[PDB]
PDB file of C-alpha atoms and ligand atoms in Angstrom:
ATOM      1  CA  UNK O   1       6.784 -10.105  18.947  1.00  0.00           C
ATOM      2  CA  UNK O   2       3.031  -9.265  18.828  1.00  0.00           C
ATOM      3  CA  UNK O   3       2.665  -6.595  17.156  1.00  0.00           C
ATOM      4  CA  UNK O   4       1.945  -6.091  13.525  1.00  0.00           C
ATOM      5  CA  UNK O   5       4.474  -4.378  10.823  1.00  0.00           C
ATOM      6  CA  UNK O   6       3.302  -4.440   6.876  1.00  0.00           C
ATOM      7  CA  UNK O   7       5.937  -4.722   5.269  1.00  0.00           C
ATOM      8  CA  UNK O   8       6.475  -3.216   1.295  1.00  0.00           C
ATOM      9  CA  UNK O   9       5.839  -6.272  -0.818  1.00  0.00           C
ATOM     10  CA  UNK O  10       9.082  -6.578  -3.159  1.00  0.00           C
ATOM     11  CA  UNK O  11       6.862  -4.384  -6.159  1.00  0.00           C
ATOM     12  CA  UNK O  12       6.253  -1.533  -3.289  1.00  0.00           C
ATOM     13  CA  UNK O  13       9.618  -1.365  -2.716  1.00  0.00           C
ATOM     14  CA  UNK O  14      10.468  -1.103  -7.033  1.00  0.00           C
ATOM     15  CA  UNK O  15       7.158   1.951  -6.969  1.00  0.00           C
ATOM     16  CA  UNK O  16       9.393   3.170  -3.972  1.00  0.00           C
ATOM     17  CA  UNK O  17      12.458   2.823  -5.577  1.00  0.00           C
ATOM     18  CA  UNK O  18      10.768   4.580  -8.757  1.00  0.00           C
ATOM     19  CA  UNK O  19       9.484   7.182  -7.200  1.00  0.00           C
ATOM     20  CA  UNK O  20      12.921   8.385  -5.097  1.00  0.00           C
ATOM     21  CA  UNK O  21      14.023   8.040  -9.154  1.00  0.00           C
ATOM     22  CA  UNK O  22      11.728  11.080 -10.020  1.00  0.00           C
ATOM     23  CA  UNK O  23      12.261  12.999  -7.064  1.00  0.00           C
ATOM     24  CA  UNK O  24      15.903  13.232  -7.696  1.00  0.00           C
ATOM     25  CA  UNK O  25      15.241  13.441 -11.499  1.00  0.00           C
ATOM     26  CA  UNK O  26      12.941  16.617 -10.657  1.00  0.00           C
ATOM     27  CA  UNK O  27      14.972  18.103  -7.864  1.00  0.00           C
ATOM     28  CA  UNK O  28      18.225  18.106  -7.759  1.00  0.00           C
ATOM     29  CA  UNK O  29      18.505  15.126  -4.872  1.00  0.00           C
ATOM     30  CA  UNK O  30      16.702  12.725  -2.385  1.00  0.00           C
ATOM     31  CA  UNK O  31      17.510  12.821   1.137  1.00  0.00           C
ATOM     32  CA  UNK O  32      15.838   9.448   1.573  1.00  0.00           C
ATOM     33  CA  UNK O  33      19.454   8.753   0.195  1.00  0.00           C
ATOM     34  CA  UNK O  34      21.717  11.892   1.209  1.00  0.00           C
ATOM     35  CA  UNK O  35      25.084  10.487   2.162  1.00  0.00           C
ATOM     36  CA  UNK O  36      26.705  13.711   5.095  1.00  0.00           C
ATOM     37  CA  UNK O  37      29.918  14.995   4.847  1.00  0.00           C
ATOM     38  CA  UNK O  38      32.660  13.264   6.924  1.00  0.00           C
ATOM     39  CA  UNK O  39      29.976  10.242   6.976  1.00  0.00           C
ATOM     40  CA  UNK O  40      30.019   7.028   3.756  1.00  0.00           C
ATOM     41  CA  UNK O  41      27.372   5.945   1.258  1.00  0.00           C
ATOM     42  CA  UNK O  42      27.715   2.750   3.813  1.00  0.00           C
ATOM     43  CA  UNK O  43      27.217   4.064   7.264  1.00  0.00           C
ATOM     44  CA  UNK O  44      24.049   5.700   5.461  1.00  0.00           C
ATOM     45  CA  UNK O  45      21.440   4.385   7.146  1.00  0.00           C
ATOM     46  CA  UNK O  46      17.264   4.572   6.808  1.00  0.00           C
ATOM     47  CA  UNK O  47      14.588   6.740   7.752  1.00  0.00           C
ATOM     48  CA  UNK O  48      13.358   5.595  11.726  1.00  0.00           C
ATOM     49  CA  UNK O  49       9.965   7.080  11.285  1.00  0.00           C
ATOM     50  CA  UNK O  50       8.055   9.014   9.114  1.00  0.00           C
ATOM     51  CA  UNK O  51       4.701  12.328   9.427  1.00  0.00           C
ATOM     52  CA  UNK O  52       1.128  10.860   8.113  1.00  0.00           C
ATOM     53  CA  UNK O  53      -0.683  13.220   9.402  1.00  0.00           C
ATOM     54  CA  UNK O  54      -0.270  17.358   9.272  1.00  0.00           C
ATOM     55  CA  UNK O  55      -2.101  19.707   8.663  1.00  0.00           C
ATOM     56  CA  UNK O  56      -1.034  23.319   7.349  1.00  0.00           C
ATOM     57  CA  UNK O  57      -2.215  26.713   9.128  1.00  0.00           C
ATOM     58  CA  UNK O  58      -5.937  27.016   7.054  1.00  0.00           C
ATOM     59  CA  UNK O  59      -6.755  23.176   7.219  1.00  0.00           C
ATOM     60  CA  UNK O  60     -10.083  23.069   8.245  1.00  0.00           C
ATOM     61  CA  UNK O  61     -10.669  27.341   8.370  1.00  0.00           C
ATOM     62  CA  UNK O  62     -11.230  29.776   6.389  1.00  0.00           C
ATOM     63  CA  UNK O  63      -8.107  30.853   4.954  1.00  0.00           C
ATOM     64  CA  UNK O  64      -4.687  29.927   2.204  1.00  0.00           C
ATOM     65  CA  UNK O  65      -3.687  26.253   2.454  1.00  0.00           C
ATOM     66  CA  UNK O  66       0.016  26.545   2.657  1.00  0.00           C
ATOM     67  CA  UNK O  67       2.510  24.178   2.056  1.00  0.00           C
ATOM     68  CA  UNK O  68       6.051  25.774   1.500  1.00  0.00           C
ATOM     69  CA  UNK O  69       7.087  25.249   5.660  1.00  0.00           C
ATOM     70  CA  UNK O  70       6.162  22.383   6.282  1.00  0.00           C
ATOM     71  CA  UNK O  71       8.641  21.830   3.599  1.00  0.00           C
ATOM     72  CA  UNK O  72      11.336  23.504   4.225  1.00  0.00           C
ATOM     73  CA  UNK O  73      11.151  23.028   7.867  1.00  0.00           C
ATOM     74  CA  UNK O  74      10.879  18.842   6.743  1.00  0.00           C
ATOM     75  CA  UNK O  75      13.805  19.868   4.829  1.00  0.00           C
ATOM     76  CA  UNK O  76      15.424  21.362   7.696  1.00  0.00           C
ATOM     77  CA  UNK O  77      14.914  18.637   9.719  1.00  0.00           C
ATOM     78  CA  UNK O  78      16.497  16.028   7.793  1.00  0.00           C
ATOM     79  CA  UNK O  79      12.875  13.875   7.149  1.00  0.00           C
ATOM     80  CA  UNK O  80      12.662  11.910   3.721  1.00  0.00           C
ATOM     81  CA  UNK O  81       9.079  11.855   3.072  1.00  0.00           C
ATOM     82  CA  UNK O  82       5.806  13.624   4.479  1.00  0.00           C
ATOM     83  CA  UNK O  83       2.265  13.577   4.082  1.00  0.00           C
ATOM     84  CA  UNK O  84       0.196  17.034   4.124  1.00  0.00           C
ATOM     85  CA  UNK O  85      -3.759  15.271   4.649  1.00  0.00           C
ATOM     86  CA  UNK O  86      -4.865  18.230   4.921  1.00  0.00           C
ATOM     87  CA  UNK O  87      -9.659  18.798   5.693  1.00  0.00           C
ATOM     88  CA  UNK O  88     -11.428  16.973   3.182  1.00  0.00           C
ATOM     89  CA  UNK O  89      -9.468  18.598   0.325  1.00  0.00           C
ATOM     90  CA  UNK O  90      -5.875  18.307  -1.908  1.00  0.00           C
ATOM     91  CA  UNK O  91      -5.299  22.297  -1.938  1.00  0.00           C
ATOM     92  CA  UNK O  92      -1.656  22.414  -1.709  1.00  0.00           C
ATOM     93  CA  UNK O  93      -0.494  18.796  -3.144  1.00  0.00           C
ATOM     94  CA  UNK O  94       0.090  20.643  -6.856  1.00  0.00           C
ATOM     95  CA  UNK O  95       2.660  23.269  -4.994  1.00  0.00           C
ATOM     96  CA  UNK O  96       3.535  20.934  -2.317  1.00  0.00           C
ATOM     97  CA  UNK O  97       4.729  18.672  -5.134  1.00  0.00           C
ATOM     98  CA  UNK O  98       7.307  20.809  -6.101  1.00  0.00           C
ATOM     99  CA  UNK O  99       8.764  21.489  -3.692  1.00  0.00           C
ATOM    100  CA  UNK O 100       8.662  18.013  -1.987  1.00  0.00           C
ATOM    101  CA  UNK O 101      10.651  17.599  -4.857  1.00  0.00           C
ATOM    102  CA  UNK O 102      12.620  21.211  -4.882  1.00  0.00           C
ATOM    103  CA  UNK O 103      13.278  19.633  -1.638  1.00  0.00           C
ATOM    104  CA  UNK O 104      14.834  16.567  -2.268  1.00  0.00           C
ATOM    105  CA  UNK O 105      11.437  14.896   0.034  1.00  0.00           C
ATOM    106  CA  UNK O 106       8.541  12.735  -1.047  1.00  0.00           C
ATOM    107  CA  UNK O 107       5.135  13.619  -1.057  1.00  0.00           C
ATOM    108  CA  UNK O 108       3.115  11.841  -0.098  1.00  0.00           C
ATOM    109  CA  UNK O 109      -0.993  12.494  -0.518  1.00  0.00           C
ATOM    110  CA  UNK O 110      -3.711  11.863   1.651  1.00  0.00           C
ATOM    111  CA  UNK O 111      -6.824  14.014   3.083  1.00  0.00           C
ATOM    112  CA  UNK O 112      -8.294  14.082   6.772  1.00  0.00           C
ATOM    113  CA  UNK O 113     -11.943  13.636   6.775  1.00  0.00           C
ATOM    114  CA  UNK O 114     -15.413  13.262   9.163  1.00  0.00           C
ATOM    115  CA  UNK O 115     -17.159  10.240   8.762  1.00  0.00           C
ATOM    116  CA  UNK O 116     -20.805   9.127   9.165  1.00  0.00           C
ATOM    117  CA  UNK O 117     -21.344   5.020   9.649  1.00  0.00           C
ATOM    118  CA  UNK O 118     -24.988   3.151  10.529  1.00  0.00           C
ATOM    119  CA  UNK O 119     -22.752   2.019  13.832  1.00  0.00           C
ATOM    120  CA  UNK O 120     -22.397   4.840  15.549  1.00  0.00           C
ATOM    121  CA  UNK O 121     -25.712   6.818  14.544  1.00  0.00           C
ATOM    122  CA  UNK O 122     -24.952  10.276  13.893  1.00  0.00           C
ATOM    123  CA  UNK O 123     -22.048  10.514  15.382  1.00  0.00           C
ATOM    124  CA  UNK O 124     -18.603  12.327  12.642  1.00  0.00           C
ATOM    125  CA  UNK O 125     -15.771   9.398  12.974  1.00  0.00           C
ATOM    126  CA  UNK O 126     -12.162  10.851  12.194  1.00  0.00           C
ATOM    127  CA  UNK O 127     -10.137   8.824   9.486  1.00  0.00           C
ATOM    128  CA  UNK O 128      -7.321   9.656   7.281  1.00  0.00           C
ATOM    129  CA  UNK O 129      -7.462   8.436   3.575  1.00  0.00           C
ATOM    130  CA  UNK O 130      -3.370   8.077   2.323  1.00  0.00           C
ATOM    131  CA  UNK O 131      -3.370   7.427  -1.431  1.00  0.00           C
ATOM    132  CA  UNK O 132      -0.180   5.205  -1.820  1.00  0.00           C
ATOM    133  CA  UNK O 133      -0.402   4.719  -6.341  1.00  0.00           C
ATOM    134  CA  UNK O 134      -2.411   6.839  -8.841  1.00  0.00           C
ATOM    135  CA  UNK O 135      -6.064   4.723  -8.268  1.00  0.00           C
ATOM    136  CA  UNK O 136      -5.880   5.512  -5.028  1.00  0.00           C
ATOM    137  CA  UNK O 137      -5.386   9.697  -5.622  1.00  0.00           C
ATOM    138  CA  UNK O 138      -8.140   9.288  -8.056  1.00  0.00           C
ATOM    139  CA  UNK O 139     -10.188   7.933  -5.622  1.00  0.00           C
ATOM    140  CA  UNK O 140      -9.353   9.540  -2.560  1.00  0.00           C
ATOM    141  CA  UNK O 141     -10.693  12.153  -5.165  1.00  0.00           C
ATOM    142  CA  UNK O 142     -13.440  10.396  -6.387  1.00  0.00           C
ATOM    143  CA  UNK O 143     -13.887  11.287  -1.864  1.00  0.00           C
ATOM    144  CA  UNK O 144     -13.745  14.734  -1.691  1.00  0.00           C
ATOM    145  CA  UNK O 145     -16.488  15.770  -4.498  1.00  0.00           C
ATOM    146  CA  UNK O 146     -18.648  12.744  -2.874  1.00  0.00           C
ATOM    147  CA  UNK O 147     -18.039  14.609   0.393  1.00  0.00           C
ATOM    148  CA  UNK O 148     -18.997  17.608  -0.859  1.00  0.00           C
ATOM    149  CA  UNK O 149     -21.394  16.696  -3.963  1.00  0.00           C
ATOM    150  CA  UNK O 150     -23.746  15.542  -1.679  1.00  0.00           C
ATOM    151  CA  UNK O 151     -23.860  19.300  -0.436  1.00  0.00           C
ATOM    152  CA  UNK O 152     -23.025  19.871   3.978  1.00  0.00           C
ATOM    153  CA  UNK O 153     -25.406  22.399   6.882  1.00  0.00           C
ATOM    154  CA  UNK O 154     -22.620  23.396   9.171  1.00  0.00           C
ATOM    155  CA  UNK O 155     -20.619  20.604  10.463  1.00  0.00           C
ATOM    156  CA  UNK O 156     -19.180  20.330   7.302  1.00  0.00           C
ATOM    157  CA  UNK O 157     -18.483  18.028   4.526  1.00  0.00           C
ATOM    158  CA  UNK O 158     -18.574  14.249   5.763  1.00  0.00           C
ATOM    159  CA  UNK O 159     -17.762  10.837   3.757  1.00  0.00           C
ATOM    160  CA  UNK O 160     -20.108   8.106   4.113  1.00  0.00           C
ATOM    161  CA  UNK O 161     -17.868   5.236   6.127  1.00  0.00           C
ATOM    162  CA  UNK O 162     -20.033   2.714   3.425  1.00  0.00           C
ATOM    163  CA  UNK O 163     -18.638   4.811   0.245  1.00  0.00           C
ATOM    164  CA  UNK O 164     -15.075   3.767   1.036  1.00  0.00           C
ATOM    165  CA  UNK O 165     -16.469   0.088  -0.241  1.00  0.00           C
ATOM    166  CA  UNK O 166     -16.055   0.852  -3.830  1.00  0.00           C
ATOM    167  CA  UNK O 167     -13.365   3.682  -3.493  1.00  0.00           C
ATOM    168  CA  UNK O 168     -11.240   1.009  -1.781  1.00  0.00           C
ATOM    169  CA  UNK O 169      -7.792   0.378  -3.883  1.00  0.00           C
ATOM    170  CA  UNK O 170      -4.697   2.387  -3.475  1.00  0.00           C
ATOM    171  CA  UNK O 171      -5.858   4.091  -0.021  1.00  0.00           C
ATOM    172  CA  UNK O 172      -4.399   3.467   3.497  1.00  0.00           C
ATOM    173  CA  UNK O 173      -6.168   3.842   6.771  1.00  0.00           C
ATOM    174  CA  UNK O 174      -4.863   5.273   8.919  1.00  0.00           C
ATOM    175  CA  UNK O 175      -8.084   4.899  12.302  1.00  0.00           C
ATOM    176  CA  UNK O 176      -8.133   9.123  13.200  1.00  0.00           C
ATOM    177  CA  UNK O 177      -7.286   7.438  17.540  1.00  0.00           C
ATOM    178  CA  UNK O 178      -9.554   8.732  20.378  1.00  0.00           C
ATOM    179  CA  UNK O 179     -11.429  10.196  17.419  1.00  0.00           C
ATOM    180  CA  UNK O 180     -12.053   7.408  14.597  1.00  0.00           C
ATOM    181  CA  UNK O 181     -15.080   4.833  15.266  1.00  0.00           C
ATOM    182  CA  UNK O 182     -13.298   2.146  17.464  1.00  0.00           C
ATOM    183  CA  UNK O 183     -10.995   3.842  19.761  1.00  0.00           C
ATOM    184  CA  UNK O 184     -14.206   5.798  20.557  1.00  0.00           C
ATOM    185  CA  UNK O 185     -15.038   2.399  20.200  1.00  0.00           C
ATOM    186  CA  UNK O 186     -12.757   0.827  22.969  1.00  0.00           C
ATOM    187  CA  UNK O 187     -13.045   4.289  24.829  1.00  0.00           C
ATOM    188  CA  UNK O 188     -16.954   3.239  25.912  1.00  0.00           C
ATOM    189  CA  UNK O 189     -16.116  -0.047  26.067  1.00  0.00           C
ATOM    190  CA  UNK O 190     -18.205  -1.491  23.244  1.00  0.00           C
ATOM    191  CA  UNK O 191     -16.157  -4.172  22.706  1.00  0.00           C
ATOM    192  CA  UNK O 192     -19.441  -5.499  20.074  1.00  0.00           C
ATOM    193  CA  UNK O 193     -19.107  -2.242  17.479  1.00  0.00           C
ATOM    194  CA  UNK O 194     -15.440  -2.299  18.193  1.00  0.00           C
ATOM    195  CA  UNK O 195     -15.886  -5.762  16.838  1.00  0.00           C
ATOM    196  CA  UNK O 196     -18.117  -5.242  13.386  1.00  0.00           C
ATOM    197  CA  UNK O 197     -15.708  -1.770  12.838  1.00  0.00           C
ATOM    198  CA  UNK O 198     -12.052  -4.097  11.818  1.00  0.00           C
ATOM    199  CA  UNK O 199     -14.334  -6.588  10.279  1.00  0.00           C
ATOM    200  CA  UNK O 200     -15.344  -3.562   7.800  1.00  0.00           C
ATOM    201  CA  UNK O 201     -11.661  -2.503   8.165  1.00  0.00           C
ATOM    202  CA  UNK O 202     -10.094  -6.210   7.620  1.00  0.00           C
ATOM    203  CA  UNK O 203     -12.709  -7.547   4.983  1.00  0.00           C
ATOM    204  CA  UNK O 204     -12.051  -4.356   3.278  1.00  0.00           C
ATOM    205  CA  UNK O 205      -8.546  -2.942   3.770  1.00  0.00           C
ATOM    206  CA  UNK O 206      -6.081  -6.777   4.425  1.00  0.00           C
ATOM    207  CA  UNK O 207      -3.268  -4.385   5.281  1.00  0.00           C
ATOM    208  CA  UNK O 208      -4.471  -1.230   4.466  1.00  0.00           C
ATOM    209  CA  UNK O 209      -6.153   0.127   8.413  1.00  0.00           C
ATOM    210  CA  UNK O 210      -3.794   1.030  11.101  1.00  0.00           C
ATOM    211  CA  UNK O 211      -4.004   2.185  14.215  1.00  0.00           C
ATOM    212  CA  UNK O 212      -3.586   5.206  14.724  1.00  0.00           C
ATOM    213  CA  UNK O 213      -1.181   5.593  18.435  1.00  0.00           C
ATOM    214  CA  UNK O 214      -0.786   9.771  19.658  1.00  0.00           C
ATOM    215  CA  UNK O 215       1.302  10.999  22.632  1.00  0.00           C
ATOM    216  CA  UNK O 216       0.860  15.081  22.170  1.00  0.00           C
ATOM    217  CA  UNK O 217      -1.126  15.488  26.186  1.00  0.00           C
ATOM    218  CA  UNK O 218      -4.412  15.971  25.674  1.00  0.00           C
ATOM    219  CA  UNK O 219      -7.549  13.678  27.208  1.00  0.00           C
ATOM    220  CA  UNK O 220      -8.187   9.500  26.347  1.00  0.00           C
ATOM    221  CA  UNK O 221      -4.768   9.642  24.662  1.00  0.00           C
ATOM    222  CA  UNK O 222      -2.862   7.279  26.666  1.00  0.00           C
ATOM    223  CA  UNK O 223      -6.503   5.219  27.610  1.00  0.00           C
ATOM    224  CA  UNK O 224      -6.855   5.132  23.887  1.00  0.00           C
ATOM    225  CA  UNK O 225      -3.204   3.528  23.574  1.00  0.00           C
ATOM    226  CA  UNK O 226      -3.757   1.047  26.203  1.00  0.00           C
ATOM    227  CA  UNK O 227      -6.930  -0.544  24.729  1.00  0.00           C
ATOM    228  CA  UNK O 228      -5.456  -0.114  20.902  1.00  0.00           C
ATOM    229  CA  UNK O 229      -2.377  -2.041  21.954  1.00  0.00           C
ATOM    230  CA  UNK O 230      -4.433  -4.405  24.029  1.00  0.00           C
ATOM    231  CA  UNK O 231      -6.551  -4.825  20.903  1.00  0.00           C
ATOM    232  CA  UNK O 232      -4.151  -4.865  17.672  1.00  0.00           C
ATOM    233  CA  UNK O 233      -2.331  -8.439  19.681  1.00  0.00           C
ATOM    234  CA  UNK O 234      -4.637  -9.607  20.057  1.00  0.00           C
ATOM    235  CA  UNK O 235      -6.115  -9.316  17.015  1.00  0.00           C
ATOM    236  CA  UNK O 236      -2.205  -9.650  14.179  1.00  0.00           C
ATOM    237  CA  UNK O 237      -3.322  -5.890  13.408  1.00  0.00           C
ATOM    238  CA  UNK O 238      -0.013  -3.009  13.328  1.00  0.00           C
ATOM    239  CA  UNK O 239      -0.335   0.641  15.425  1.00  0.00           C
ATOM    240  CA  UNK O 240       1.090   3.745  13.360  1.00  0.00           C
ATOM    241  CA  UNK O 241       2.416   6.759  15.305  1.00  0.00           C
ATOM    242  CA  UNK O 242       1.436  10.036  14.532  1.00  0.00           C
ATOM    243  CA  UNK O 243       1.597  13.067  16.021  1.00  0.00           C
ATOM    244  CA  UNK O 244      -1.889  14.638  14.010  1.00  0.00           C
ATOM    245  CA  UNK O 245       0.705  17.866  13.568  1.00  0.00           C
ATOM    246  CA  UNK O 246      -1.626  21.669  13.349  1.00  0.00           C
ATOM    247  CA  UNK O 247       1.383  23.372  13.123  1.00  0.00           C
ATOM    248  CA  UNK O 248       5.030  23.894  13.044  1.00  0.00           C
ATOM    249  CA  UNK O 249       7.128  24.934  15.886  1.00  0.00           C
ATOM    250  CA  UNK O 250       5.031  24.262  19.626  1.00  0.00           C
ATOM    251  CA  UNK O 251       6.023  28.335  19.691  1.00  0.00           C
ATOM    252  CA  UNK O 252       2.794  28.511  16.681  1.00  0.00           C
ATOM    253  CA  UNK O 253       0.022  27.251  19.541  1.00  0.00           C
ATOM    254  CA  UNK O 254      -0.267  30.701  20.242  1.00  0.00           C
ATOM    255  CA  UNK O 255      -2.080  31.893  16.663  1.00  0.00           C
ATOM    256  CA  UNK O 256      -3.040  28.185  16.434  1.00  0.00           C
ATOM    257  CA  UNK O 257      -5.358  28.847  18.706  1.00  0.00           C
ATOM    258  CA  UNK O 258      -6.767  32.357  18.296  1.00  0.00           C
ATOM    259  CA  UNK O 259      -7.015  31.711  13.921  1.00  0.00           C
ATOM    260  CA  UNK O 260      -9.421  28.057  15.760  1.00  0.00           C
ATOM    261  CA  UNK O 261     -11.377  31.291  17.595  1.00  0.00           C
ATOM    262  CA  UNK O 262     -12.439  33.807  15.635  1.00  0.00           C
ATOM    263  CA  UNK O 263     -13.750  30.982  12.653  1.00  0.00           C
ATOM    264  CA  UNK O 264     -15.481  29.482  15.722  1.00  0.00           C
ATOM    265  CA  UNK O 265     -17.241  32.437  17.030  1.00  0.00           C
ATOM    266  CA  UNK O 266     -15.857  32.124  20.743  1.00  0.00           C
ATOM    267  CA  UNK O 267     -13.475  24.069  24.099  1.00  0.00           C
ATOM    268  CA  UNK O 268      -9.125  23.250  24.034  1.00  0.00           C
ATOM    269  CA  UNK O 269      -9.372  20.426  21.063  1.00  0.00           C
ATOM    270  CA  UNK O 270      -5.138  21.413  20.663  1.00  0.00           C
ATOM    271  CA  UNK O 271      -2.269  20.695  22.451  1.00  0.00           C
ATOM    272  CA  UNK O 272       0.770  22.582  21.805  1.00  0.00           C
ATOM    273  CA  UNK O 273       2.797  19.484  21.846  1.00  0.00           C
ATOM    274  CA  UNK O 274       0.664  19.584  17.971  1.00  0.00           C
ATOM    275  CA  UNK O 275       4.031  20.219  16.186  1.00  0.00           C
ATOM    276  CA  UNK O 276       6.591  19.097  13.569  1.00  0.00           C
ATOM    277  CA  UNK O 277       9.057  17.354  16.705  1.00  0.00           C
ATOM    278  CA  UNK O 278      12.231  15.499  15.305  1.00  0.00           C
ATOM    279  CA  UNK O 279      12.855  11.956  14.524  1.00  0.00           C
ATOM    280  CA  UNK O 280      15.004  12.076  18.099  1.00  0.00           C
ATOM    281  CA  UNK O 281      11.684  13.538  19.313  1.00  0.00           C
ATOM    282  CA  UNK O 282       8.630  10.423  17.641  1.00  0.00           C
ATOM    283  CA  UNK O 283      11.196   8.398  18.443  1.00  0.00           C
ATOM    284  CA  UNK O 284      11.542   8.823  22.090  1.00  0.00           C
ATOM    285  CA  UNK O 285       8.469   9.030  22.376  1.00  0.00           C
ATOM    286  CA  UNK O 286       7.168   6.017  20.722  1.00  0.00           C
ATOM    287  CA  UNK O 287      10.960   3.962  22.575  1.00  0.00           C
ATOM    288  CA  UNK O 288       8.534   1.302  24.020  1.00  0.00           C
ATOM    289  CA  UNK O 289       6.481   0.886  21.066  1.00  0.00           C
ATOM    290  CA  UNK O 290       9.075   0.427  17.717  1.00  0.00           C
ATOM    291  CA  UNK O 291       6.658  -1.359  15.508  1.00  0.00           C
ATOM    292  CA  UNK O 292       3.643   2.168  15.542  1.00  0.00           C
ATOM    293  CA  UNK O 293       7.566   3.775  13.839  1.00  0.00           C
ATOM    294  CA  UNK O 294       8.074   0.844  12.244  1.00  0.00           C
ATOM    295  CA  UNK O 295       5.081   1.142  10.168  1.00  0.00           C
ATOM    296  CA  UNK O 296       5.374   4.876   8.776  1.00  0.00           C
ATOM    297  CA  UNK O 297       8.333   4.711   7.324  1.00  0.00           C
ATOM    298  CA  UNK O 298       6.632   1.534   5.776  1.00  0.00           C
ATOM    299  CA  UNK O 299       3.869   3.210   4.368  1.00  0.00           C
ATOM    300  CA  UNK O 300       5.840   6.015   3.497  1.00  0.00           C
ATOM    301  CA  UNK O 301       7.938   2.966   0.975  1.00  0.00           C
ATOM    302  CA  UNK O 302       4.239   2.631   0.999  1.00  0.00           C
ATOM    303  CA  UNK O 303       2.804   5.730  -0.931  1.00  0.00           C
ATOM    304  CA  UNK O 304       3.547   6.166  -4.415  1.00  0.00           C
ATOM    305  CA  UNK O 305       1.281   9.158  -6.286  1.00  0.00           C
ATOM    306  CA  UNK O 306       3.434  10.270  -9.545  1.00  0.00           C
TER     307      UNK O 306
HETATM  308 CL1   CL I   1      24.978   9.099   5.759  1.00  0.00          CL
END
């Protein structure tokens, strides 16, 4: 296969084992190391998929950051790790960390951003930032502070892409898919701009930038996916599957659409597929691109914030 999986190094694997020890010592269980009843230690299997892009209900709007229901759902699905990636905030982190531990889940720390870059002018693009280690966590905190400190208008807090140069250490980036700088430029056929953007990530985020692939039945998602996979194969860039999770169950879609409208003051930016899909569901969805699934599990092992 010419699609790259970025494997956690021996050092990262050791940090992952230590991070699971912490889950287990604080919580009294660890789903990653759990043995099903009538199963055996010898027949235990690794996770096939981990959610790395997940928002609480009020993430980009006004309201509380309740992360309890996301942990509750992940625990019910037997998920051994979960990221919360709320919009330019870490509100729910302290509670997510504790609840994660209580449920035997490895908590992964991240946030979603709107990004501005000179190459794209004034246009805002999507980026997900994961903290791989405590230095990354500190840098993620600093990046959020920087976005607020320079102030914002109705468009909300924004980061400059170039701020990532100085703040890069311990961060793993998910590209934003069709909404990211690379994705938008792929959809527009701007090969020269794709090349400039990819050069930035290769320089500052070596093995720490993933082309995000998303299948939620929204416009341009699959056309972008085709182009991203072609780019990934030609450049050796790793792809990663996410489900851009915005609510817990598919039946929650109705309430989500309405919460967004109230805040907006009224545009169909969201799909009913953006729920917390099971590992089995995600594996079937990306059966044709198993590398996109494998990279979620490797990224999950690489993310160890204590
Ligand atoms: Cl098992």
